[PDB]
Amino acid sequence: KKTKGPDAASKLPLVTPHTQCRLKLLKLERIKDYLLMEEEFIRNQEQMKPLEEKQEEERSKVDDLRGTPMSVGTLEEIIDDHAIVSTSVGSEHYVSILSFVDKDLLEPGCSVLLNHKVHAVIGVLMDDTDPLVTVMKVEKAPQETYADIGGLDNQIQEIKESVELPLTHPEYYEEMGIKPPKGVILYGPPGTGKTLLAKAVANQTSATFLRVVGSELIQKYLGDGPKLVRELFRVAEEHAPSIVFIDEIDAIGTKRYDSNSGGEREIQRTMLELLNQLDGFDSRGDVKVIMATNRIETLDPALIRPGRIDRKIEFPLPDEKTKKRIFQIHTSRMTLADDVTLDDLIMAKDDLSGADIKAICTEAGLMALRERRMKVTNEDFKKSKENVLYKKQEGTPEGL
Amino acid sequence: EVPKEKEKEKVSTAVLSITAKAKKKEKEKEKKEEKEKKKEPEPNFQLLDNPARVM
Amino acid sequence: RALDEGDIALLKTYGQSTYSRQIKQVEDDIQQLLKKINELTGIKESDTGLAPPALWDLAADKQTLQSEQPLQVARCTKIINADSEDPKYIINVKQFAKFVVDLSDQVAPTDIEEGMRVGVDRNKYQIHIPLPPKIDPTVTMMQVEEKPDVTYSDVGGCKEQIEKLREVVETPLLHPERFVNLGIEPPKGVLLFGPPGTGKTLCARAVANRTDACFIRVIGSELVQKYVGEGARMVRELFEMARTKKACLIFFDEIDAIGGARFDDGAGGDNEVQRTMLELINQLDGFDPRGNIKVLMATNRPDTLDPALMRPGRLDRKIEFSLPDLEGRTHIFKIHARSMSVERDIRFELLARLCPNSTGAEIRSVCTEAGMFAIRARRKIATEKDFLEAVNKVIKSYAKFSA
Amino acid sequence: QELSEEDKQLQDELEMLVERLGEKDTSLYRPALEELRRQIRSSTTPLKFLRPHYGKLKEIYENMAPGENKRFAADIISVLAMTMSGERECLKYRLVGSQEELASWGHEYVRHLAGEVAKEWQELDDAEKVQREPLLTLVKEIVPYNMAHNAEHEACDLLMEIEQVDMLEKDIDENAYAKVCLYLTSCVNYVPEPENSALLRCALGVFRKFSRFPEALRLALMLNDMELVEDIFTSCKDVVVQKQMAFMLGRHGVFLELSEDVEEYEDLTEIMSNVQLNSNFLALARELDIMEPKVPDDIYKTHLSARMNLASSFVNGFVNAAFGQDKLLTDDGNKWLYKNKDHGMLSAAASLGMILLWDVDGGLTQIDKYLYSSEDYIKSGALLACGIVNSGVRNECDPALALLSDYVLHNSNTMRLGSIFGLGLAYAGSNREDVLTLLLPVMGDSKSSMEVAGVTALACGMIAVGSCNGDVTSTILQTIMEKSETELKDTYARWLPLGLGLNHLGKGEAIEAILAALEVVSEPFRSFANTLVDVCAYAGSGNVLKVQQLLHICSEHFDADMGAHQGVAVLGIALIAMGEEIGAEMALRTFGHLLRYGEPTLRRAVPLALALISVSNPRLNILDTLSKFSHDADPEVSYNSIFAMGMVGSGTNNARLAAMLRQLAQYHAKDPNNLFMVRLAQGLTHLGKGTLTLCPYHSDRQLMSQVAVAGLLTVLVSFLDVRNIILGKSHYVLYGLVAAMQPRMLVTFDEELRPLPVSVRVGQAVDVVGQAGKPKTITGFQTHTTPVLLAHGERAELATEEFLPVTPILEGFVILRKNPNYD
Amino acid sequence: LREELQLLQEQGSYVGEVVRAMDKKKVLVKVHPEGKFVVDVDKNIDINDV
């Protein structure tokens, strides 16, 4: 019921300085001039019409036969000449439609019109705007790019190779005759994992992306967590072949619990279905599944096997240079200071992750804005460290 | 008896900012490179032949 | 220490760029134009069919207007219930109606059957068009599967299982001897079970080796669904589709929820399961024995319900394998190395020995890993790439055992 | 509201002070203001308190007696008007003020002062040049402050607002000059022509001052001033800068004609002539193992006819172009051409020349045998193959001029056409007086057909592209006049305006004279020709005025069918602002609305501009839109969409795009008209094995190479109406891609000019920090040996600080020298 | 008023919750007894008046 959405927005995110200057201003002037010129062009094309031809042949033949009163009802089935449609209050009409009949947009399960009186289909509402039962492609092909995260070059190269084995050079292992949807099993500290999302946006620069986080311990009798994600990556194969990011759920939803039977069914259903979808012998598709987690230990033996689920990748903590890069990225939007106090905040630091970096960068701005409002608050030099302590790392009685 | 009709379908260009700066430069270059017969004489002083529709 | 009101505006006007306000106003204008042109769309009509149908199919729409008085028999369509000896038809109608009509003169009573949907002309509700819907939901399009599964070298031939099932499936489909020499009908059933592994690959091989009456891979976990009667209808339409497609074999898979466990918690924990069981028995009871259609159920553990003792009359011949020895493993290596750019000059017998009872699935996985290692090395060559073959296979065996 | 206690106390103290200063007697006026100003200029290194005292402070400042009291009062009014500013009261009060050292009054104050100074410098009329000098002195005082406190980019903003880049040059030091020059270059793309040339000149001045001649040459090429290029080449003297200049001219393709008095002139002219281009390209292809001749058949994937075989030959030539290694047309080539039918032998021989392009020595020998062929088509194709072979690459003895001796004006139409197109491709960018004086008389011939004259015009335009060759233009106009209008405006005179646009490429302004001379022409062809030449001259400028004129003219009904020039307007829409990413993306969106609600001719033309925007750049949205519009009802629209996909994927080997084209081939297997050109698009995608890109934007994708864009625009002018012309005869016009066909890998030499194996880090290079004019930031270090294919979006960087390049721009050729700190 | 009663004999008017105002004088509306009833626009109110 959903194929694509009109992407006529996100006007050129590449505003080079992203700070108020003559270059950025001139870029915005060119942008607004382009908008003005496009509006003027379309308006002149539509107003200075190429030709006046009667009622555009609309009111003459099709509009009148469509008629004034109408009612909306779903279209159920299709026959060679007639169409079998399930209109409102459970009505069913098998009528052939010849006025404003767009078969491609008609489709089963779509809203069509009924002209009353002699009830026959006379049009379709392709908008409809109610495909809301299970919605996971709403966030598809996220705009985040490689440059958003730095200092993770090894992991970026590894994931890029693992997901550019398809798309790029598919004939490679087409001739090798394997077509491996191995996916990638991502490790990493709990202090990250949205960093795993960030390294997934690198692939998300190509095709769409689906997310299943936490889901549930599928108590549902039908199960169908992994089975519905299977239907959805079938939908992704219908679309651009999308990835499936199941960070955390690959860990809890697929937990290597030593218990065998009498255990939440997922162990019966979920792991087996995960393996069935992860084996390329059952389902085709350039879909690559990214099973991320922060608990490598709970890797189930089925998930452990590189035989079906290959391309194990470990996300380590950032190094000194990686910390420098990530802090540069996060403070670049905020013009931290003119003294560029960069290395003092990280030289003695250990076990600081991307979430903490973002949090401390945000809290530095918050504390400056609180009362120290001084643009590049001169206080920032040490207040970045002040809110870099911020306690909150960990607290558990004394026990020591 | 005369319509005095015009079909234009003409809309003015909406050039606004840098097109208009160029228009300012265009200004810089462009700077150098029936009453006597209508007051008194309404046609009411005419002569008409014997056959003439007059109330 | 809030001290915000007025001070915040003053500090916001304190710095800025020289033309930061100018840029703000310009980007506001950009967004304004954006919304204006999003309102000033292109094809500003939700309904489509603009001209390609509205120029010549619209001319045919003039013909359908001239015939607008006919083709109005749509109204509403409801299923029929039953009938009398011949003329009258007592029907339950989706308007809850106790509906009986003289079937329309153009429709003979033979075509209309109980439980089929017919449209009724509002004026007299005559049986005008008995639509044979045969509508399949998307999950049913998954239960039905491809016919030409393609033949292999007995998909990693385990001679015992295949040669035990050929007389039970291949032989009846050949129909050479079932009628006279052996008792009336061939063995009533076949249960190709076994641990996750070789199960159903032999079924696929038999499907390829047999006629076009080719199997469908239906799943019991998908059969068990919410609400009541949907699973029954799904099994019914399963049998209907299999019967229509040249009386193909029905491959029930993962029978541990369709049959459930051996118990129901309180006869209310899974009673939809029992409802499905009753109708599935009613369907695959065969009634009149018929060497035409075939059925095979495959699970990994014999967790079938009480019909497990009726099935000796119905589903006999329980067989299994999923226990590859050295010869089976090396033959699976051979059939898989038939794929890829590999050849058999590799001493794959060494790896076959290295992995005791590594299924056929894990052998296929090791071949996939060998190809992946080759492409990682960027060498598409795998025929003489044998030492690298052995290295990747052994390191991935190490990883599978302990990673 | 309850404010802070100390804050309220200080507010009351300042209230008492301002009341004292507003008292009647002035004997306490001075001490009050002495006390006040010290804490006024305190927070900047307060202003909230004096918010409601605007009028009282104005009265006090006006009432202050002239002198110290008055000028401090003006100082305080100025430093407070940054808050209480309904106008540039700060600057009026400061001009009245002390004009002593201002920079101590806080960074916010000095920045607001700089902005107001820029506003007044723009606001003051021409007749007002009295205060301009004080504002300029204030500017020259604030510029050092910005340089010290990393405000050099807004310093550049204000200096460009006041048009004082000339003293920007003198004030800027090299320690921050690189980012300032990068900022200038970024502004260049969007500033209009007068200040654009001004900033280009100032950037040349900065780089000449700081001995930054390699990038200064890039900037001079942007300026398209060959005189300044020669001047700066003379200015630089070191052997390394000389040889990198020669590389840069050779890569651009324009030959610089100089004297042998310079040192190592032989090597300089050789490397400018691209003699070693072919050798290095084959060596790197072999090192990549990418040399095997890829068969058009296994490109087609035939696991599941004369014109189709012709298309197969053409795509084979595209794949094996610049290689010269293909036995398919070498061993049994005579058999293939004999089996070929009707008009395609010429194109087959030209495709063989495409295989042998840039290979002078080998190509000439392997085409000499086919030169003496029997069929006129084969002979003309062989001559065109010779022209393709010598195209781009320059030669000392220039064999093409002598080889095309009788065929240049040969009576036979096909032989003359082949020779003329060959000479055009050869002397493209040479601007050679002898070649011009030999081909323009051929232009003057009356026996040649209309399309032959058009091809002569095309050759002349591609030879004298961007030269404003007055005699060429006069010959063009005279030939147009002599030809009668009725037979002029049929289907082929569309090459004369193309030649005019090439000859005046990138110049502008003077086009008024050309269009006034052409005004005598009748509307159906004049309205097309003037638009074409205008857009070609103003290409790469971003003239929103010109493009909105094009939009207005294509908005007309134009329904003998003069509405063809709507197509050239559509092409010009992309052509004007194709330079940077903006002006190309939005322009894409404009094309989308054109297709969304446009005339049949408009939608026929749109895919051409879509391809022009992003040739050799496989943008996903472009590919999707073109694929969705490839199945339109209009056959010409389908053809243009097919070729547009081929062009945007050209020189990319994009696997998913190739799969999409294979699916299109399956879709269009029933109709050969779409089928053979889908094959053509696949051949374009795999052209040169993807080694040579087709985008005319080189030197970090920001320089317009006139010859390449000329050839590309000729191809797009043909594809304006291939629905007639490619179906009829123009199987030769497709060979204009030689100009746009340039390799996109890195070839590293050393000071002794030997191939270095130095490895570099290659990956996506997009801006991360825009705080200033920082160099583009690369991510994804997939380092390997130096031969690396450079596509859009991604750049290269040296792995270590061990090999210093002649220029930081890393594409095409580069010399790497050992760093003094290399260890 | 009698003519109003005769109009009300045909229910008079029908309450409709307007949702989508299409450009071709078209509004989907929703009616409580049934729901959406795509219909034309009145003469006293323009397309934009919706």
Ligand SMILES: Nc1ncnc2c1ncn2[C@@H]1O[C@H](COP(=O)(O)OP(=O)(O)OP(=O)(O)O)[C@@H](O)[C@H]1O
């Ligand atoms: N004997 C065999 N020879 C070759 N491949 C085999 C063999 N047994 C299993 N396989 C491989 O195992 C995978 C799945 O096999 P199969 O279809 O028999 O099982 P399934 O339907 O996944 O279920 P289960 O493993 O529970 O039986 C395939 O990749 C198949 O190639």
Ligand SMILES: Nc1ncnc2c1ncn2[C@@H]1O[C@H](COP(=O)(O)OP(=O)(O)O)[C@@H](O)[C@H]1O
């Ligand atoms: N190295 C990095 N560079 C840039 N951004 C990062 C980096 N690491 C994390 N981030 C950003 O910070 C956010 C939080 O990441 P992460 O630490 O994984 O969160 P969590 O710990 O909640 O999973 C991410 O969405 C990502 O955009």
